[PDB]
């Protein structure tokens, strides 16, 4: 870049450089994320291969596509380092894991900026509807204690964590939200967890969480007031896994077109500061 | 139009060979009917041991194998016979050493992807027996995997090596024709050929050095099965003397409708469209029609003029004495001017004119000129009748077409304008001199003629003097028109014949009647 | 004149193939003489 | 010594098109015309590719 | 084409032609009727239907006992069909496949799995198979009639995409040939092209938090008027509502133009 | 307007804007990477602290500077998770590890773009002088087999890896280069290694590999034709480690000025990437 300042021209030359799918077929990569159960049901040693030849049909050169195996929504949630240009992740609603799923969607579907937090030495504060605490790891257990303007507890003793308020009991991915503009002494189990202070924003012009199962709704809003429904949030009717993949292939471009590359220069988008 | 079609042919004769050359290598040394089909077949093998102690095999090869069976189709029991053979097999060998006690296979055949399996099929239903004209056939068959069974090589002493494995899948490929001749009668069939794909498992020979090879060996290709089966469906889509009819069939051709169809480049693809045949007739036949041309009147003749130029332009140092009515030697004019190789009966001029016509005339055509060129009236005749006949069969199309050229419009003349002077070489007989405008006749000349013919554009005088002068008087004929009626313009001519209808409609018609052959 | 003859040729070259392809199915036999072929190492007899 | 021939799926009819179009939107003008005064016959067309 | 001149001349009413000339067919599950437990429920509701304006011989009551059997047999009998569906969470999709069939206009041809391996053409060419027990295994062919991850010879290498369903709308990667292996003994598979929708059914859904996908793709989600939902209490209540709002439900549908050669 | 569409017009206003170092002192972080031996020789429990107070002199607020300990060039060359805004890495001259060092420099000093490779299912090929295969892990052992236009080996049997060509025997960081435009069946020891396909892009406006000892080199060009010498490639004369650090501190700004803003990370981006 170096350039944003100094506006573009709005003249309606009206020409539209035809296509766009013919540049993405040549230059981009497609990464498919699925759960173990998905592949196990397929039971072939060459399914990744067969689908790949089928992918040439839709226009993706041999070395282009891929296949990454998450075995659970919890593991996939923490060490997600989206590998390719375009990532389409397959999630088959599991009804008890809904929020696990919501927290994972909220992370992939969106653009995140994070800094590290030292729960040990400092007493901090969430700023706007976009400042959230995203923690993830083996077993994430977060207890909180709100401070009045004196560094004193409110319903707690900053001295004994037995008076803290538990807001997460051993999760694999957690986006914690506290009353904005209030300091809190935090007590995470840093041994198995890592908690970082993130500011939200830009969405993701990649993922395309495709949901298998139920009667699926997701609520990225930590609030109650809003409900956002984006194009990068699709849903498929479950029959068999082979069918799911056939559809994903038969409609790759349609799915890719709902995302759009150009937004992917980081390994993992846990933006570090 | 005809210009192309005709010439187009002699142009594409070089092909005649290539094709011709195929059928040799390959040569030896209406009504629809349906039917699912069930093809059961099997292989056979020939295994020959070498002499000596008994540790060596000389040959393991495929041999044709027959199978007979019955199956149900549409509530009827069908009896079928098949013969399975292979082609393009590969020779492998195994050399365990030169000692009398070393295991050896001098030659064993294996079918691989460069090989084919053929299954000849016959059955006893009625649709099959009624297949003698076949316009078209496609098969939709399941594939089948043929796998090799074990074959033990019983050595006089010890442990026996065993050939095991091997496999190929068979895929329907190309549909033809075929027929089986046994001690007395024939069994018509359009044997399909199966292309092969190698499959698992690979083959090997235990106790040796032969493993992980792909293809099906001839040692035990049936693997104890009574037969292999390929089933599916196939669809079939089915349908001197000559002259005397062509003539009569001509007496009806319209007029205007004809002319036009002589302003349409009826080339290759066009002529052999309408024909409806059994197989690669019109095809190798549009090629045979060729393989006839390059062996007839039009052929050689044209081949002559060509040389007569080379030879006379190459010679010069030793240019043939010949003679030339005109400025100077030039095949066209002179070579005819002199080699008046025939003789007796009338007057000078006419004879040269004539012989200078022969070359000039017919000949000219297959090169460069304007307006409807005689032949383009001929082609019209052909593409016409050769359609109002319906026929198929090979032995016809050729020749007849050719022969059409050599014998169409027996005579006919030409003209060359230059300074308002119609010089008309009335082939065979006659010749006149015009004053373009006021249709008049002044002394014609063998000279002025000479050159102006040799190198300038000519015209296939559709209508000639006789018709013209008679036309000019009982009508009008604007200077405008006239000037066209010479170049033998399509339009202006079409008009009259289409409009007016007097004379013009005889000079034309008469020609049709002349291309009687 | 020459115009044709010359051009006429380059026009009908596509044929070259078809024909070319005949004489092969027809000429002699072809032979796969590439059987890979592996190289050296040196190991030997060891007893007294 | 390969068992079975390679099998490579090809691009579908509808596919290819969508690109031809877009690829046209750039053809020059003058440069084009000309190349329509040159008997681009047989031997010519199947030269590149 | 119709002339486009606008000058308002409202027809007034619409519902008074449909009351006189059309038939209404109510489809429900057995459980629905069993819970009602009356020998005259069909009759009582019929008199109640006169209120909403449907002459005695007008309304018919068809009993499907399962979503699977009903899905096979939707030989929709009347002019207007409103089908009541019960939220069974394990059967969801079965339900989706059945909705996809009634709510839409279909064109089909027969397929011979035995002799010709097929391919779907566009986002509208689907394979709808249905019967006793539908089990479909597939094998994609490369441009040689050779398998891709399978041997066109042994169906043990095929890819199973349906294991014993009563109604199945199969979708494969467009523009690829496939050797198919259905269990034709108990199943029938036909090649259908989609399209026109249905200006009749009105699938009324009982229970859940009913949102469900009816597209084969992931990109689209269509919500039509002929796709209604009711809050479950008791079955008698459901029917009372269906009657109390017959016209509203009918108005969300309205008589077909398909020039359908099957009839 | 974000769309990484560009224009800018250079009128010479000539407003030479002042300082530059007084924005970096306030807003940026400095991360010092050294080897264990470095710290061991220092032998103080408060060296990180003493140097930090000394860093206030050069203008870096207390919580600003961080001290990361790599214990070897091989491990350091691994995950490369450069933590701070400005990274200056101290490399002690080990003559047997030169290429290990070269491969590590090539990674930090430059801007890399990578994708994952599946050695199992797809034989790959590099495209230009900028497409390289960077693999790293416990023990990286890469054997290669060039394919002719048939998917057949050339000097190898795509079937038996005993015929492959070994191009790396158990390294911790490896940037492999093969003849451009040729497919290769790859055989890495994925158990302990990870191999990824990278395209070299921009350079790094951060690191500043400071080299201790030798007489020196470390060439990051794979070719023979070029030799690039950048500002982010400095060298110091070894005496004692305490001296090295004193110098690094006494010339922090000079070293920082030779780096600056890590442009690929700058907020102001978009179509270019982060």
UniProtKB/Swiss-Prot annotation, chain E:
Binding site residues for Ca(2+) 1: 38, 149, 157, 159
Protein name: Outer capsid glycoprotein VP7
Keywords attached to this entry: Calcium, Capsid protein, Disulfide bond, Glycoprotein, Host endoplasmic reticulum, Host-virus interaction, Metal-binding, Outer capsid protein, Signal, T=13 icosahedral capsid protein, Virion
Cystine residue pairs: 25-78, 108-192, 134-187, 139-150
Region (GPR motif): 196-198
Organism classification: Viruses, Riboviria, Orthornavirae, Duplornaviricota, Resentoviricetes
Organism of derivation: Rotavirus A (strain RVA/Monkey/United States/RRV/1975/G3P5B[3])
Shown segment, full-protein numbering: 58 to 320 of 326
Post-translational modification summary for this protein: N-glycosylated. The N-terminus is blocked possibly by pyroglutamic acid.
General remark: Some rotavirus strains are neuraminidase-sensitive and require sialic acid to attach to the cell surface. Some rotavirus strains are integrin-dependent. Some rotavirus strains depend on ganglioside for their entry into the host cell. Hsp70 also seems to be involved in the entry of some strains.
């Amino acid at each position: 870049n170096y350039g944003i300042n100094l506006p573009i021209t709005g003249s309606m030359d009206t020409a539209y450089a035809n296509s766009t799918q013919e540049e993405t077929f040549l230059t981009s990569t497609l990464c498919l994320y699925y759960p173990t159960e998905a592949a196990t049901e397929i039971n072939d040693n060459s399914w990744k291969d067969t689908l790949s030849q089928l992918f040439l049909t839709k226009g993706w050169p041999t070395g282009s596509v891929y296949f990454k195996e998450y075995t659970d929504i919890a593991s996939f949630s923490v060490d997600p380092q989206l590998y390719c240009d375009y990532n389409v992740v397959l999630m088959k609603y599991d009804a008890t894991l809904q929020l696990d799923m919501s927290e994972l969607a909220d992370l992939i579907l969106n653009e995140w900026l994070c800094n590290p937090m030292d729960i040990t030495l400092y007493y901090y504060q969430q700023t706007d509807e976009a400042n959230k605490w995203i923690s993830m790891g083996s077993s994430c257990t977060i207890k909180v204690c709100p401070l009045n303007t004196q560094t004193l507890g409110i319903g707690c003793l900053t001295t004994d964590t037995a008076t803290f308020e538990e807001v997460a009991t051993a999760e694999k991915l957690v986006i914690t939200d506290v009353v904005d503009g209030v300091n809190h002494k935090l007590d995470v189990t840093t041994a198995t967890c890592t908690i970082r202070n993130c500011k939200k924003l830009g969405p993701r012009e990649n993922v395309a969480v495709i949901q298998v199962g139920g009667s699926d709704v997701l609520d990225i809003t930590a609030d109650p007031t809003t409900a956002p429904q984006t194009e990068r949030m699709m849903r498929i009717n479950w029959k068999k896994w082979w069918q799911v993949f056939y559809t994903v292939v038969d409609y790759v471009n349609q799915i890719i077109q709902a995302m759009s590359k150009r937004s992917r220069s980081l390994n993992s988008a846990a933006f570090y500061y | 139009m005809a210009s192309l079609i005709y010439r187009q042919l002699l142009t594409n004769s070089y092909t005649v060979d290539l094709s011709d050359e195929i059928q040799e290598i390959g040569s030896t040394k209406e009504m629809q009917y349906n039917r699912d089909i069930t093809i059961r077949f099997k292989f056979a093998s020939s295994i020959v041991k070498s002499g000596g102690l008994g540790y060596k095999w000389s040959e393991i090869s495929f041999k044709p194998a027959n199978y007979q069976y019955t199956y149900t189709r549409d509530g009827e029991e069908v009896t079928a016979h098949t013969t399975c053979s292979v082609n393009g097999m590969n020779d492998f060998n195994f050399n365990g050493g030169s000692l009398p006690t070393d295991f050896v296979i001098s030659r064993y055949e294996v079918i691989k992807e460069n090989s084919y399996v053929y299954v000849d099929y016959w059955d006893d239903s009625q649709a099959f027996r009624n297949m003698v004209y076949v316009r078209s056939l496609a098969a939709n068959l399941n594939s089948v995997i043929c796998t090799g069974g074990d074959y033990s090589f019983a050595l006089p002493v010890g442990q026996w090596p065993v050939m095991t494995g091997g496999a190929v899948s068979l895929h329907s490929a190309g549909v033809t024709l075929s027929t089986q001749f046994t001690d007395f009668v024939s069994l018509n069939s359009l044997r399909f050929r199966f292309r092969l794909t190698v499959e698992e498992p690979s083959f090997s020979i235990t106790r040796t050095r032969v493993s992980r090879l792909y293809g099906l060996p001839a040692a035990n290709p049936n693997n104890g099965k009574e037969y292999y089966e390929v089933a599916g469906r196939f669809s079939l889509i089915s349908l001197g003397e000559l002259r005397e009819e062509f003539n009569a069939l001509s007496q009806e051709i319209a007029m205007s409708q004809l002319i036009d169809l002589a302003l349409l480049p009826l080339d290759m693809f066009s002529m052999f469209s309408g024909i409806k045949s059994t197989i690669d007739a019109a095809k190798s036949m549009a090629t045979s029609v060729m393989k006839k041309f390059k062996k007839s009147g039009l052929a050689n003749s044209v081949s002559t003029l060509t040389d007569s130029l080379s030879d006379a332009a190459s010679s010069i140092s030793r240019g043939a004495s010949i003679r030339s009515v005109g400025s100077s030697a030039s095949a066209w004019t002179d070579v005819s001017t002199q080699i008046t190789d025939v003789s007796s009966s009338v007057s000078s001029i006419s004879t040269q004119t004539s012989t200078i016509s022969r070359r000039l005339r017919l000949k000219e055509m297959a090169t460069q000129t304007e307006g409807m060129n005689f032949d383009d009236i001929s082609a019209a005749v052909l593409k016409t009748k050769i359609d109002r006949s319906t026929q198929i069969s090979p032995n016809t199309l050729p020749d007849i077409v050719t022969e059409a050229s050599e014998k169409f419009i027996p005579n006919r003349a030409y003209r060359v304008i230059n300074n308002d002077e119609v010089f008309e070489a009335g082939t065979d007989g006659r010749f006149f001199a015009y004053r373009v405008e006021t249709f008049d006749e002044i002394p014609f000349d063998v000279q002025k003629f000479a050159d102006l013919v040799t190198d300038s554009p000519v015209i296939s005088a559709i209508i000639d003097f006789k018709t013209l002068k008679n036309l000019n008087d009982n009508y009008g004929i604007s200077r405008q028109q006239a000037f066209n009626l010479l170049r033998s313009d399509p339009r202006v001519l079409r008009e009259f014949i289409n409009q007016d209808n007097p004379i013009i409609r005889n000079r034309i018609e008469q020609l049709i009647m002349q291309c009687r052959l | 004149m020459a115009s044709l003859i010359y051009r006429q040729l380059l026009t009908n070259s596509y044929t070259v193939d078809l024909s070319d392809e005949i004489q092969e199915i027809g000429s002699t036999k072809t032979q796969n003489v590439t059987i890979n072929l592996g190289p050296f190492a040196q190991t030997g007899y060891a007893p007294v | 010594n390969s068992v079975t021939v390679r099998q490579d799926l090809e691009r579908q009819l509808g596919e290819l098109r969508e690109e031809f179009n877009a690829l046209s939107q750039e053809i020059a003008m003058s440069q084009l015309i000309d190349l329509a005064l040159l008997p681009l016959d047989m031997f010519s067309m199947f030269s590149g590719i």
